[PDB]
TrEMBL record, chain A:
Name the UniProt record assigns to this protein: PS2
Interval of the full protein contained in this chain: 368 to 415 of 510
Lineage of the species this protein comes from: Bacteria, Bacillati, Actinomycetota, Actinomycetes, Mycobacteriales
UniProtKB/TrEMBL annotation, chain B:
Species whose genome carries this gene: Corynebacterium glutamicum
Domain of life, source organism: Bacteria
Gene name in the database record: csp2
Listed name of the protein: PS2
Residues of the full protein shown: 272 to 319 of 510
TrEMBL record, chain D:
Organism: Corynebacterium glutamicum
Residues of the full protein shown: 176 to 223 of 510
Record protein name field: PS2
Length: 48, 48, 96, 48
């Protein structure tokens, strides 16, 4: 919440933000497939 | 130029973007866990 | 004043080089005494106001955040700002 | 600035007592660097 590794050297600190945004997007796209395959569609079939 | 630089560089120290990214990621995890739990409850209710 | 001073003093992470610890009010005289030298006290108060306004611009630098132990946290600036506004109002009151 | 400074420095004949040689700009910091301490530079300019 309040650490050095969060407010870095330059005021810009844009490269770290973009790297984190990339990692977050990768995780979100993987999670879409994971959740769709594990529980969403087995439930959707019964509801249909 | 110096006046504007001071004014904007001071304001760019109030906020820390990496904390806000961390909170966004936590909110996403909360959302998907929430829909998993809601599916559990709806499934149990229909089963009963 | 003194509580805000200590709040701002504890809310900084720099290595004392350019933003320094603010000394407590009235180092020259003891204002608890019945008859103190009040000119010294007003001098110290004006010195504090000037020092705060001077460190303001070093708060607005790009490269202040350098290293573990030399950097500026996001809560330092509101503490300094509250201290500055309070000193400004206090001086405006003490003038007449 | 620096060329005019050296022009004025070479155009005096006094013995340095009251009109002195002007030092070259930004003795405190190296402004060639990517991130210099610009407050020091502005201080030096105002001093000049």
């Amino acid at each position: 919440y309040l650490h050095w590794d969060t407010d870095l050297a330059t005021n810009d600190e844009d490269e770290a933000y973009y790297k984190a945004k990339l990692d977050f997007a990768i995780e979100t796209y993987a999670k879409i497939l994971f959740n769709g395959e594990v529980w969403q569609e087995p439930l959707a079939y019964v509801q249909n | 130029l110096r006046a504007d630089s001071i004014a904007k560089n001071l304001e760019a120290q109030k906020s820390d973007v990496l904390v806000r990214q961390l909170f966004l990621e936590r909110a996403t995890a909360q959302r998907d866990t929430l829909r998993v739990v809601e599916a559990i409850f709806s499934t149990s209710a229909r089963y009963v | 004043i003194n509580l805000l001073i200590d709040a701002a003093n504890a809310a900084n992470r720099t290595d004392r080089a350019e933003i320094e610890d603010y000394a407590h009010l009235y180092t020259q005289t003891d204002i608890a005494l019945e008859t103190p030298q009040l000119a010294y006290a007003f001098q110290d108060l004006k010195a504090l106001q000037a020092e705060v306004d001077a460190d303001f611009e070093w708060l607005g630098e790009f490269g202040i955040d350098q290293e573990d132990g030399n950097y500026v946290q996001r809560y330092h600036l509101p503490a300094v700002e509250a201290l500055k506004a309070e000193v400004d109002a206090r001086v405006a009151a003490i003038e007449p």
